[PDB]
Amino acid sequence: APDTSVSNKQNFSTDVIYQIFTDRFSDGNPANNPTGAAFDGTCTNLRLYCGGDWQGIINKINDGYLTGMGVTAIWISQPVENIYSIINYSGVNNTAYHGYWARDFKKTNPAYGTIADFQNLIAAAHAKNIKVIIDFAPNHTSPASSDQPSFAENGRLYDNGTLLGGYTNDTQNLFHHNGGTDFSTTENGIYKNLYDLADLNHNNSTVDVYLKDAIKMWLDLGIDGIRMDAVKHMPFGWQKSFMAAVNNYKPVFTFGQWFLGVNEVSPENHKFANESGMSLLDFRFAQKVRQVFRDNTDNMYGLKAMLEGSAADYAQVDDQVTFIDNHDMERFHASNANRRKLEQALAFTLTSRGVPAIYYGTEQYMSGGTDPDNRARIPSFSTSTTAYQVIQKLAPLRKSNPAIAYGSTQERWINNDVLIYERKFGSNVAVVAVNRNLNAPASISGLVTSLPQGSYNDVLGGLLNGNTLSVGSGGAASNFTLAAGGTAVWQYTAATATPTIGHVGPMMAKPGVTITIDGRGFGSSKGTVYFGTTAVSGADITSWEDTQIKVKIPAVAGGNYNIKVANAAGTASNVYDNFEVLSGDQVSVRFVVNNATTALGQNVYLTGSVSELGNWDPAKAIGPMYNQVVYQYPNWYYDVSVPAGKTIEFKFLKKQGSTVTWEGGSNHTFTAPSSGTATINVNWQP
Ligand SMILES: OC[C@@H]1C[C@H](O)[C@@H](O)[C@@H](O[C@H]2[C@H](O)[C@@H](O)[C@@H](O[C@H]3[C@H](O)[C@@H](O)[C@@H](F)O[C@@H]3CO)O[C@@H]2CO)O1
Ligand SMILES: OC[C@@H]1C[C@H](O)[C@@H](O)[C@@H](O[C@H]2[C@H](O)[C@@H](O)[C@@H](O[C@H]3[C@H](O)[C@@H](O)[C@@H](F)O[C@@H]3CO)O[C@@H]2CO)O1
Ligand SMILES: *[C@@H]1O[C@H](CO)[C@@H](O[C@H]2O[C@H](CO)[C@@H](O[C@H]3O[C@H](CO)C[C@H](O)[C@H]3O)[C@H](O)[C@H]2O)[C@H](O)[C@H]1O
Ligand SMILES: OC[C@@H]1C[C@H](O)[C@@H](O)[C@@H](O[C@H]2[C@H](O)[C@@H](O)[C@@H](O)O[C@@H]2CO)O1
Ligand SMILES: [Ca+2]
Numbered sequence: 268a269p270d271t272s273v274s275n276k277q278n279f280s281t282d283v284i285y286q287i288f289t290d291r292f293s294d295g296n297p298a299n300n301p302t303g304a305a306f307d308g309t310c311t312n313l314r315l316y317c318g319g320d321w322q323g324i325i326n327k328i329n330d331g332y333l334t335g336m337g338v339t340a341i342w343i344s345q346p347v348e349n350i351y352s353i354i355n356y357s358g359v360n361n362t363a364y365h366g367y368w369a370r371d372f373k374k375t376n377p378a379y380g381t382i383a384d385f386q387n388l389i390a391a392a393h394a395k396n397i398k399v400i401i402d403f404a405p406n407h408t409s410p411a412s413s414d415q416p417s418f419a420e421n422g423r424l425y426d427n428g429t430l431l432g433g434y435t436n437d438t439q440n441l442f443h444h445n446g447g448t449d450f451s452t453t454e455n456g457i458y459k460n461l462y463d464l465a466d467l468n469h470n471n472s473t474v475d476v477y478l479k480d481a482i483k484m485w486l487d488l489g490i491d492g493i494r495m496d497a498v499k500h501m502p503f504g505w506q507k508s509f510m511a512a513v514n515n516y517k518p519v520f521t522f523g524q525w526f527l528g529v530n531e532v533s534p535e536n537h538k539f540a541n542e543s544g545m546s547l548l549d550f551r552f553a554q555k556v557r558q559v560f561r562d563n564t565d566n567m568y569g570l571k572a573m574l575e576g577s578a579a580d581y582a583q584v585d586d587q588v589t590f591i592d593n594h595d596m597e598r599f600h601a602s603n604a605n606r607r608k609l610e611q612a613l614a615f616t617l618t619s620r621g622v623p624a625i626y627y628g629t630e631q632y633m634s635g636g637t638d639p640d641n642r643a644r645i646p647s648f649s650t651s652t653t654a655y656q657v658i659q660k661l662a663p664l665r666k667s668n669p670a671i672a673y674g675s676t677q678e679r680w681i682n683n684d685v686l687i688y689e690r691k692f693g694s695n696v697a698v699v700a701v702n703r704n705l706n707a708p709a710s711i712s713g714l715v716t717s718l719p720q721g722s723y724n725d726v727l728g729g730l731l732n733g734n735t736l737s738v739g740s741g742g743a744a745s746n747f748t749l750a751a752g753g754t755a756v757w758q759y760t761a762a763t764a765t766p767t768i769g770h771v772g773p774m775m776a777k778p779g780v781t782i783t784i785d786g787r788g789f790g791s792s793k794g795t796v797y798f799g800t801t802a803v804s805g806a807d808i809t810s811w812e813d814t815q816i817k818v819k820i821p822a823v824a825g826g827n828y829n830i831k832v833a834n835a836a837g838t839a840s841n842v843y844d845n846f847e848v849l850s851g852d853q854v855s856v857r858f859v860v861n862n863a864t865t866a867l868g869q870n871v872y873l874t875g876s877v878s879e880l881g882n883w884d885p886a887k888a889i890g891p892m893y894n895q896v897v898y899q900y901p902n903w904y905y906d907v908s909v910p911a912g913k914t915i916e917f918k919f920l921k922k923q924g925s926t927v928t929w930e931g932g933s934n935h936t937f938t939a940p941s942s943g944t945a946t947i948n949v950n951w952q953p
């Protein structure tokens with residue numbers, strides 16, 4: 268199959284995701300609607316169920332609404348059974364219409380549908396070349412009160428109907444009892460409750476095993492990807508182990524929700540996207556886009572800096588899920604704003620690197636403030652809006668033009684208000700011009716591109732006041748006027764002669780697992796795949812075609828490897844780096860070191876005899892470790908993904924910058940569990 272196929276669960280870069288708030292999209296089966304105080308068929312009361320369900324999505328898939336727009340993937344509300352309680356918050360009734368208050372990760376939310384309905388949804392979507400991503404929120408269950416078990420459902424966790432336990436009388440320690448977070452530190456936000464949400468204890472073997480088994484159920488149902496809720500709120504090491512469970516079973520494109528505020532650039536966030544085994548929702552991109560096109564708090568230079576910085580910061584920038592708004596922020600379009608702002612932001616997003624996600628109703632100019640105002644029922648299914656047409660014209664380019672899906676990004680022309688950028692991949696090019704100034708045109712002269720000589724019609728057809736481009740030899744464009752609020756797209760596509768890797772997924776797994784290498788120019792005959800210096804050819808290459816290769820990871824030692832391919836003729840491709848070969852199946856283990864004193868700015872890290880611990884390389888050590896919540900300084904702790912059942916030697920380090928202080932004495936040793944979790948507690952050796 269080609270890279271663009273709906274069957275490709277490892278790569279969404281050629282797709283356009285449509286984020287559906289299930290309850291607010293389409294009620295295709297009124298018979299499953301909740302009732303009484305929990306329901307509002309008119310959807311006036313935005314905190315109650317409105318009736319939107321899976322049957323509704325199926326209908327919209329079948330009637331051309333989504334397909335006509337060029338949408339090729341949907342991200343739906345968490346499908347698992349949520350609490351049925353109607354919570355009264357300061358005199359206001361609240362329900363689980365949003366799907367984020369889970370009670371049983373092994374059952375469906377009856378309001379959305381039955382398991383059968385889910386299967387039908389998967390089937391209907393696939394039939395229309397639409398991939399299905401489910402939201403998944405393993406950070407917590409639901410609202411709870413320890414000293415008020417009568418409140419809500421006490422955050423009770425069920426296993427396919429079987430009660431595991433609740434927040435109250437949590438003798439099992441299924442949950443964290445560390446209070447609530449103020450978001451003051453990453454550690455604080457991980458080990459304390461988000462609001463009043465019962466925080467699941469990922470260090471508890473039952474919880475750990477249960478969650479991994481639960482996801483497996485969904486994978487078996489045929490999902491194509493996962494949107495992980497609150498990834499900044501769960502132990503990173505645990506999440507890595509979770510991603511390993513997924514990848515070592517049935518890998519699917521996974522992206523996490525890690526909020527970034529205006530102007531926030533987080534190295535920790537970069538590291539997570541780079542080493543967790545999952546990518547992230549691109550808040551950096553979204554926030555910058557809002558500043559530039561919506562709020563006027565930054566200009567094109569800021570947009571350019573975000574593009575350049577992000578491309579360097581994220582090992583796989585093409586895996587970051589971009590967006591302009593979502594259910595947790597005010598809608599992009601302000602009721603009184605010029606619609607062109609929204610249209611441009613959309614055009615920008617659709618033609619930029621990563622994986623674009625469109626919040627349902629954006630195309631209908633929905634406006635709305637903070638939750639729940641940003642979750643109204645979609646008011647229309649009109650294909651006639653300018654925004655709908657913008658998506659319709661641009662979304663498909665992700666499939667037809669690999670420069671858009673996998674290309675580099677280069678600024679070609681810029682000023683406060685104008686940005687002209689170029690996407691390039693193989694013999695494919697796309698040039699996008701955006702003039703955010705709604706009142707002033709710009710005179711574009713000196714524009715140089717990689718486009719072949721000739722005249723280029725705006726892909727947008729002048730929809731956003733774009734114009735035709737005239738390119739001479741050398742790629743120089745003739746002078747032109749970029750209209751006020753103008754947005755234009757010019758492209759060129761052709762067969763690529765040389766093997767070129769545009770994407771690899773998953774990026775982390777154990778030997779034997781099949782990975783997908785996508786791109787162009789691979790040729791039709793089986794070639795060679797390289798993992799670092801190791802060559803793979805023949806049988807282990809399951810399938811090979813011009814745009815896609817399926818190959819089993821060789822039994823190399825755990826570590827980080829650069830991927831490269833060569834066609835049957837021996838011509839090598841570019842290198843796709845950062846591939847992580849795991850040492851085997853993973854388990855989440857908590858490491859605790861006592862009496863490790865440090866000076867301000869100096870932190871404790873973990874190192875050891877397996878690639879998962881950085882193979883004794885301080886530059887690859889695990890940390891910095893925590894020392895506030897679960898354990899207190901001078902004691903430090905950290906949850907780490909390690910190879911199951913392996914005997915591992917390790918030591919702790921004290922690092923300040925790249926300066927390292929090693930624990931004295933001999934290495935510590937332990938044998939990782941075969942399944943579930945474990946806690947290894949030792950003392951710092953001077
Ligand atoms: O190839 C010649 C030229 C030499 C420069 O050192 C190099 O940067 C590159 O120049 C590009 C700029 O990088 C582009 O930004 C653009 O310049 C535009 C400005 O962006 C715009 O503000 C206005 F000053 O017009 C400039 C063009 O005259 O194009 C130039 C190349 O023309 O390459
Ligand atoms: O270079 C290969 C080396 C051979 C050893 O037999 C094997 O154990 C492994 O060595 C590890 C040590 O086991 C680690 O303890 C650590 O050594 C640290 C010391 O712990 C520390 O006290 C300080 F002397 O620095 C040493 C590192 O420079 O790392 C080595 C690998 O470098 O691998
Ligand atoms: C990631 O997960 C969170 C947590 O579930 C989602 O938010 C949902 O849960 C929130 C808390 O229950 C809901 O918000 C309520 O509580 C906040 C706290 O003050 C204020 C709101 O007014 C309440 O509705 C929220 O509505 C849910 O969506 C995120 O949406 C998800 O991305
Ligand atoms: O709690 C995190 C904090 C971050 C610092 O960078 C790290 O040094 C350490 O801080 C220690 C100091 O090193 C120690 O001297 C003493 O001041 O306690 C703090 C921890 O509260 O941890
Ligand atoms: Ca319904």
Ligand SMILES: [Ca+2]
Binds near residue numbers: 406459502
């Ligand atoms: Ca948590």
